[PDB]
Design a protein around this ligand. Sequence first.
Ligand SMILES: Nc1nc2c(ncn2[C@H]2C[C@H](O)[C@@H](COP(=O)(O)OP(=O)(O)OP(=O)(O)O)O2)c(=S)[nH]1
Ligand SMILES: [Ca+2]
Ligand SMILES: [Ca+2]
Ligand SMILES: [Cl-]
Ligand code: NA
Ligand code: NA
Length: 325
Amino acid sequence: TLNGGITDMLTELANFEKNVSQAIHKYNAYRKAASVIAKYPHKIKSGAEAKKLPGVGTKIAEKIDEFLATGKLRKLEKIRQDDTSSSINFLTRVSGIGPSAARKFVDEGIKTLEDLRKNEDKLNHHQRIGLKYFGDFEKRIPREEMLQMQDIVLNEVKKVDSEYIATVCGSFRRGAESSGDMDVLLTHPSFTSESTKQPKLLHQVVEQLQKVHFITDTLSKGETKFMGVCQLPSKNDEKEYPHRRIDIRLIPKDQYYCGVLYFTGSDIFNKNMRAHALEKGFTINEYTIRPLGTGVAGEPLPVDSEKDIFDYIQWKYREPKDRSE
DNA sequence: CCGACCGCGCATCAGC
DNA sequence: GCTGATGCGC
DNA sequence: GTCGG
Ligand SMILES: Nc1nc2c(ncn2[C@H]2C[C@H](O)[C@@H](COP(=O)(O)OP(=O)(O)OP(=O)(O)O)O2)c(=S)[nH]1
Ligand SMILES: [Ca+2]
Ligand SMILES: [Ca+2]
Ligand SMILES: [Cl-]
Ligand code: NA
Ligand code: NA
């Protein structure tokens, strides 16, 4: 938290561009700069000191100057005062409400937590569950609880078929002491890039996790991506655990290493890596790394480890715990 | 400069 | 019903 | 908003 004052500022600005301005590249620009200043291992004394880092330019320089003097950012102070944009940025904290839906509701006078509860009929399914567990989802999960959840999901995946492999990823695999939510990579030998020797593969796992009341709600579901809700079992008289966001990704087993790369993140690490891949003439997604021959994807290169992906784009390997950009 | 700015799964809707 | 585009999220 | 041809 060396320059916590500054990354916070830039994150709030990032949210405002993402949510009220619907300016996604400004949101990325602001987030990259917050990321690179967070990695910086000195207390920043100057806006010019910051401009030296990639992703800090003039406009962020001047804002860091204003903030270091006054402790504030006038732009942020007035953004806070504005009743409209403050409401739109609140509504996007509900899972399923993004920047268009948040602005559509505040056009209809729906702008506070009491108003969403009154008009749940105007909300789709993902937004209803988002509203139901709004408080729970704001809470972070302790690594202790993440370890309990891991044991339930892996023991249940083993009871459906012992050939499943389930790998917990996200900030957990990077060694976070606390997690936003849980992310499970799933392979089965019957699902590769060649064929899908068995159907319902992801369905079976979700069904069983629902049969034991671990999974409690479904935001979205398909053949390879599940997005929903889960809860640890509690003991007698114990207050129930908070409900938790769970994501499960069924990845073809021969593409495990590219998938576990994707799912370990961070999101910003993923972005710097794929962006650097393009500079080296490659493209990386969760499935493959492919050459660029006129900027059209050639054939998947062969991949036996995570490090093989790092070697193609000519990066030294970085442990999961060092990808938390 | 001043256009380019990762990559993709699922849900929803307009058009056909 | 499909297809593309848009919204939402990872 | 930043930045690289
Ligand atoms: N390429 C890419 N990958 C992403 C993105 N967002 C998330 N991911 C990937 C990497 C993330 O580690 C993984 C899980 O996303 P998640 O929102 O849970 O983030 P996380 O790193 O686990 O952080 P917390 O869950 O602990 O808040 O999905 C974006 S925007 N792009
Ligand atoms: Ca997570
Ligand atoms: Ca997640
Ligand atoms: Cl691919
Ligand atoms: Na810079
Ligand atoms: Na949101």
